[PDB]
A and B are shown apart, each in its own frame.
Chain A
Amino acid sequence: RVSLFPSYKLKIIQGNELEPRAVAALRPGMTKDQVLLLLGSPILRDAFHTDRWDYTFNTSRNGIIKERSNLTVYFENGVLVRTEGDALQNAAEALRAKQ
């Protein structure tokens, strides 16, 4: 279970993907279904603290983090309260670049 040998062949790992214009569409203060249709199905969803919906990314190599981008979002009583993460800004200049 040790001593990985020099195999220059690995599977292509993905973390997650999200479309930047949806980030541009992110307005605070609407319900779960509203943001659902705005974005789509989150890849994961807990239950005990189920306002944490975030996506990710990784072009990993043998399991090591290579790139990443995150945007957690919070909710109360079925409405958007806030969101934060590292992907919003880069999505912003990406949107400005292609538009």
Chain B
Amino acid sequence: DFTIQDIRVEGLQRTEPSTVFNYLPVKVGDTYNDTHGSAIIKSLYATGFFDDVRVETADGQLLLTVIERPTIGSLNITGAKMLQNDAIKKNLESFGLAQSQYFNQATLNQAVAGLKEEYLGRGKLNIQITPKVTKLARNRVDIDITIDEGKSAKITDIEFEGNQVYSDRKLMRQMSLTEGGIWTWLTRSDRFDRQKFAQDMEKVTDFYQNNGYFDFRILDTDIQTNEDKTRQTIKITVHEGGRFRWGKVSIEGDTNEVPKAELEKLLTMKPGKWYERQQMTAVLGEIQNRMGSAGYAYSEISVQPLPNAGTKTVDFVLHIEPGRKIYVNEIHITGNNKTRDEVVRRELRQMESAPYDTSKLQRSKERVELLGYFDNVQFDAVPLAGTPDKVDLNMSLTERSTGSLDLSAGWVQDTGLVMSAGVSQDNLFGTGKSAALRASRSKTTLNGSLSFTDPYFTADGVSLGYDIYGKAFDPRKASTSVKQYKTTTAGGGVRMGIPVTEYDRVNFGLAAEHLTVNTYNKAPKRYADFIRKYGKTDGADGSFKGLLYKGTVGWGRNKTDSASWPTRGYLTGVNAEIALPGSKLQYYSATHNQTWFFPLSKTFTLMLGGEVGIAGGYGRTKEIPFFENFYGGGLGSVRGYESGTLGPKVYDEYGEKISYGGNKKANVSAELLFPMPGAKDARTVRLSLFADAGSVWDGRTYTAAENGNNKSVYSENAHKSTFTNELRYSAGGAVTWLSPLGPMKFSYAYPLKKKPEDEIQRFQFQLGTTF
């Protein structure tokens, strides 16, 4: 045996032998023959230290020759043709390859193998993969991969066996892959991927499963190449089950508190259609979420078929095991930075020690997502050593940028430019306390506003807020001018808001405003009567002022995915936001909406629009203000002619034609919405048509005008522009897109029944939304 005395480790380059001895499992004065040799050699082989180190026994000064492992100080990349330099850079550095980092050849080999496999996974097989190694300075080395990809990998022929049940034409129509063609030249739609192949495989197999053929035994698939390994052909053979009939699926097991009668009620299976695979999946989902809605996350169902040919039925007995009633031990919260913790706790149920149900858990999911403060949230269940009845349910948060400035511009067809300003803020770096500034300005209007609110004034939570406004309207503009005047509206208000259930939530608000209505030189009788009834005139002009005690009552709910891509669901709601009694002008006006969406196809869909309301008031004032009139005809009305162009076009000074409209709101939308599939699934392009129904009435017939009748018949009733339930026939196209930089308006309008008293507009364009 020999004792260590200041091992003279030589042959080192930059190993700082002090830290070597520190890394040595032994120090001076340690007895050693062979025990630590393998340990030290493997320790230095780890961390990429060396490759050849020798140890001997010689008078305490053991010559530990060491050869420094190469360290890639500088790394380089090339050959990135299909992918960019950044992509290859990150996916390589994900496997080491940092500065120096003690480069090893085996790391090179595994990395190149992995990347090669990644590329061959896609439609690239005839690929030249030739990395090059250049010896840089003493330890630094350089590598650069060279990738020379093939032409492409195209699928020429698609063929099958056992196709006696359905025509290969229809089935190939069903399967979501392409072959050679002219309209398929776009976006290289005939390329191949293993993953997408498998996806289409399960898709078509499930399609057959719904077609009544049991278990659809897939025999085998094979892919065969061609000359130059360029073109490929796919052939899969399967075995169908034949037609059948299912009408007697049964369930069994224990229920504990659960009622078996409720189980029978929820069992939605019938002999009709003889089967449905996804219906079976859905009923499994329903039963499972029920089995755990009571607090059993680990109750498990067992399926088993019981065949019977001839009658061609296979019974399904569903055996359930419930057990181990589960509660929650503690809740942890992640992604809590820049915000409070109770704020997200405000909403979910199951405070603690509660029967773990997904039923209210998905409700919590929905409740937090509609907050929109985070793009992604995940709910994570984990038990501990004290396993029974107690599991952690920590959840995820994804903090998203929200504190910025709302400086956004847009363009409108009539007025022109419009700008928006104000800091966007909803969270004073913590709890909600949502308060912000919002203002807009155009050549015809301006409106500043500050908002301030807490969504939860109470334990359940009541939203209380202040909100100011200063909107002023300047209808007088260039040639395309509606009746010229100004509007002066400003002031503040308080908004209160309470939910009545998980899906219903109302909000009220009372305030008081003031307006100074003003006129111009001689205006039609609808102005003279109004001003001489309440206002005061001076010369050829005049004005009026009044108090604006206003009340507001509202309610709503959403049910569609939307997010600029509408899906199943619709908007429900009602509102009443005008100067309510308590001051002059005793008025009342309703509100409605319907946004029915029918996603019954891959791209084509239709939306039904819904609105009902009467703006008529009561009390001392039996009339309707001109400025409170509807702007019938145009975009927001019908998307048809130019804005605010329904009703009697009255003659006046200079003999122009400006209408009024009524105080009746009712609309019916029906448009075939769909994207463009040429480019990709990007959430960027739509397309539809324009076909709307809009009704608006006043009741009063108009017969006397400025020495001229603008109607075909002298006795033209002005209560409705046409027969009862008034509307004009019109329908055109609508090029939709989604976002060049966001907002848009584009559509082609074609009218019908062109009257001699109405004006049309075939195309309209707006930018940066409005308001």
Contacts and interface: CB of A to CB of B under 8 A. Distances in A.
A16 interface: yes
B390 interface: yes
B597 interface: no
B255 to A, nearest CB: 11
B26 interface: no
Contact of B355 (A10, A17, A41): A17
B498 A9 contact: yes
Nearest to A16: B353
B462 interface: yes
Contact of A19 (B256, B327, B386): B256
Looking at A4, A8, A12, A43, which has the most chain B CB atoms within 10 Å of its CB? A43
A83 to B, nearest CB: 19
B325 A9 contact: no
Determine the interface band of chain B, counting residues with CB < 8 A from chain A: 20 to 34
B353 A9 contact: no
B375 interface: no
B354 A8 contact: no
A44 B462 CA distance: 33
Contacts of B460: 7, 9-11
Looking at A12, A40, A41, which has the most chain B CB atoms within 10 Å of its CB? A41
A40 B388 contact: yes
B349 A12 contact: yes
Given A19-B325, A41-B390, A4 B500 contact: no
A41 B390 CA distance: 8
Given A9-B499, A14-B355, A40 B458 contact: no
Nearest to B354: A14
Nearest to B496: A5
B707 interface: no
Nearest to B499: A9
Contacts of B389: 40-41
Nearest to A6: B498
Contacts of A4: 458
Contacts of A14: 354-355
Given A17-B325, A19-B256, A41-B390, A7 B353 contact: no
B296 to A, nearest CB: 12
B501 interface: yes
Contact of A40 (B256, B257, B325, B500): B325
Nearest to B348: A11
Nearest to A7: B498
A17 B356 CA distance: 12
A14 B355 CA distance: 9
Nearest to B502: A9
Nearest to A4: B458
Contacts of A8: 500
Contact of B458 (A7, A12, A16, A44): A7
Contacts of A44: 353
Nearest to B459: A62
B59 to A, nearest CB: 64
Nearest to B350: A14
Contacts of B355: 14, 17
Given A7-B458, A10-B460, A11-B460, A43 B500 contact: no
Interface in B86-120: none
B71 to A, nearest CB: 54
B353 A11 contact: no
Interface in A8-56: 8-12, 14, 16-17, 19, 36, 40-41, 43-44
Contacts of A16: 353
A43 B256 contact: no
Contact of B327 (A5, A9, A11, A43): A43
Nearest to B387: A41
Contacts of B390: 41
Contact of B462 (A5, A17, A40, A41): A5
Given A19-B256, A40-B325, A43-B327, A9 B388 contact: no
A8 B505 CA distance: 11
A19 B349 CA distance: 23
B295 to A, nearest CB: 8
B508 to A, nearest CB: 12
Nearest to B461: A7
B500 A9 contact: yes
A16 B257 CA distance: 14
A50 to B, nearest CB: 14
A49 B500 CA distance: 44
A48 to B, nearest CB: 19
B498 A5 contact: yes
Interface string B341-362: 0000000010001110000000
Interface string B376-407: 00000000001011100000000000000000
Nearest to A14: B354
Given A7-B458, A8-B500, A9-B498, A43 B353 contact: yes
A40 B389 CA distance: 7
Contacts of B500: 7-9
A19 B501 CA distance: 30
A8 B504 CA distance: 11
A20 B389 CA distance: 17
Interface in B306-343: 324-325, 327
Given A7-B500, A17-B325, 4 more contacts: A5-B462, A17-B355, A40-B388, A41-B388
14 contacts: A5-B462, A7-B458, A7-B462, A7-B498, A7-B500, A9-B501, A12-B349, A14-B354, A16-B353, A36-B388, A40-B388, A41-B386, A41-B390, A44-B353
Pairs A-B, 3 closest by C-beta atoms: A41-B389, A43-B353, A41-B388
Interface of A: 4-5, 7-12, 14, 16-17, 19, 36, 40-41, 43-44
